[PDB]
Amino acid sequence: GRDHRKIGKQLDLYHMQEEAPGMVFWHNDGWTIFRELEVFVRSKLKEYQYQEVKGPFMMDRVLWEKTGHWDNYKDAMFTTSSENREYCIKPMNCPGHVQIFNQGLKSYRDLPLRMAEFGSCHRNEPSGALHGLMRVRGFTQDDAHIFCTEEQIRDEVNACIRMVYDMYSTFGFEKIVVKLSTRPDKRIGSDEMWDRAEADLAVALEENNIPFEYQLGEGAFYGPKIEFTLYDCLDRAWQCGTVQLDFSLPSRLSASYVGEDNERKVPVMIHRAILGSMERFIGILTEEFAGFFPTWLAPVQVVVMNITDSQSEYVNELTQKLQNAGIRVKADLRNEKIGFKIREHTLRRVPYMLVCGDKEVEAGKVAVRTRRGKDLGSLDVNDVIEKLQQEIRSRSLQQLEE
Amino acid sequence: GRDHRKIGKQLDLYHMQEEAPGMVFWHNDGWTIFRELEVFVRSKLKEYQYQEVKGPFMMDRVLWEKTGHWDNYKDAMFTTSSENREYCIKPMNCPGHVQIFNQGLKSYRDLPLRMAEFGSCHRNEPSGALHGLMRVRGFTQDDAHIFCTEEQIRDEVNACIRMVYDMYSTFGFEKIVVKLSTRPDKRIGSDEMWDRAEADLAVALEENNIPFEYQLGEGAFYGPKIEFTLYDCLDRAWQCGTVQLDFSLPSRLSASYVGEDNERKVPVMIHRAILGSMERFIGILTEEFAGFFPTWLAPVQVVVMNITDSQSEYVNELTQKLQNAGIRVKADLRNEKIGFKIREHTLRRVPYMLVCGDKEVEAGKVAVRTRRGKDLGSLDVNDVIEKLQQEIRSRSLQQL
């Protein structure tokens, strides 16, 4: 099946209740998936030279009123009060990043400054419109903001595009639809600015040999955007990625830097998220893989199991070796038949089941079965461990052969 | 001068702002410290056999009223509304952990069930009382809840005590004061429940030769507790650790399991946090070390630097090797005097400074100096990486 709500219950990943609508309770195994996704995103953040920060959950309404989103989005925002002051719970991470940017004098030498965050966002969405991990009130955005010059825009958008396709390919998503939203009727800035900004987005797509289409007049008042729609194995469309140019917010929040000519200048801001919601993405992945998460993401990667009582100590040593090797491993030493053990952990979607009979113990080997029902044979212990490690390190979609 | 505020500005760790009172903006380098501390706690969670979960930011006021905290703490709650329903932003993670516990049938064979979370908590406390990272509104608790039988309590308190002392030791905190809070006047349970509960805490401490003082009548209505206070290098007291028994919240939130005699039993809950608050602990550590974070915690562990342009490629190759070994490393190829470079990174409190002259390139070596002003001379490059790797992975307090 491919129902994330069904699979999430079956594999004990998460649940949701009426007491907290649209907000996920991550169980151990789901939180393990979440944390590995974070680790993966972080490796891309380091690769693409992003800083990672953390901003507070709430900020004064007075500050949010200055952003120029208040009039359009006030209904979708949670608020809470303290000592005659009203605070918004953050629906976005951008203003918080500007605050960090505003600490200390910034120079042209500091640009481009790429500031990322796994940002916990809350949006007061209608309860009737909520649906599992897909449509949620509380979520974690794989967010970042690039502060750069006008001249630097193309190269930074280019880097964002690459990062998008790079990340989607890891999960097996090759069919990507790209849409470029152009100038709306109500907008800020000159027409010549919009020409350059739109052109920067289009040229950046062309340089990566990406065909796209327009979304005419669908851009925000503060700049144009690119949206990336991935397609799952059922050919269903999921809009996840976004790259949004912004010639408004930095000026609104008093962001500036010292240029090369020694003059004060306002930086351009690029908003981008690739996965979108980490929660929604996990939901998509769950259905894409039908719960058969690639080994690097699997809550339990390996179960080591004995055929009879005879191999219990061998199982313990091999389990410890896998533990030392960094693998998420469990020993199944229960007084149960080998078929019963295999069926259970197959249903739990454990990538590998390492079976130990007499002939395995005697040879210093292990019999490797996959959750797809494949028998890869009896293999040397050290050799299996190094192959498992390589499958995990490279985040491979495929299991071992034989 | 060991002010965490000052050191936080100097090393670009964090700042705070009037628009968000008592809530931290973690900058790159400060967030790196935080994440390493998180990784350290996770290693202990694994060692001590804890699950890790994440609960939602807010829940219904109806649920929070059932916990029995509402009359005592309603003024300290942050509340927000949606569709004519009031939601509390969470001050604690316990009720959310019960919600997870209540999914699926539990038995005695599942106990003890230890459920940990890095829980983002908010408490609406007087803004005037706030100061730095020590007194905040928004914080991250190294929280956990142990669901167990009455017979399992004593063993689980033992493991909690061991976890406390183990973790404090890692940071060099050996002077620990312990206080056991006994039954208050306003309490639930028979006197006999409290005799057993207080004895469970007392004996656990007695068997570990930990001396403690009683705190008469300062216990919760739902059970007694142990609090752990550490002392920094200036001999200031920091109450950080807590172990709190609870014979109330599980019943109140409809928690149960199938016992060994085939009947519904309400589990005992143990609350425990060790560091207390991640933000405050980082505050304490920053002051304890005066910015000289042990290498495993340091935002930037190594800076590799040249004398002239001649050695640039060797520095970059050496930098790449250090990065592959899992070390937070930065290259410094600037046209500046060696005394200038070494000073800047000594001021930034970078543990190690790797200097590469012509002698070092030709010989396949590197000249190592510490921020403490110790010249270790020209050493073999592989030998250095291994010793740095060991220092980081063992989380040593001392340098070479």
Ligand SMILES: C[C@@H](O)[C@H](N)C(=O)NC/C=C/Cn1cnc2cc(Cl)c(Cl)cc2c1=O
């Ligand atoms: C990529 C990221 O940096 C960017 N801010 C982002 O979230 N883009 C995706 C969609 C952005 C569109 N959107 C959606 N809902 C919102 C709700 C509130 Cl209450 C506010 Cl104040 C703003 C928005 C908003 O702008």
Ligand SMILES: C[C@@H](O)[C@H](N)C(=O)NC/C=C/Cn1cnc2cc(Cl)c(Cl)cc2c1=O
């Ligand atoms: C160890 C951990 O699980 C435990 N909850 C904990 O935080 N212990 C420290 C003491 C915690 C005591 N305390 C403090 N402030 C609170 C504010 C609110 Cl709004 C509410 Cl509803 C409850 C409390 C509360 O009970």
Ligand SMILES: [Zn+2]
């Ligand atoms: Zn943004």
Ligand SMILES: [Zn+2]
């Ligand atoms: Zn608690």
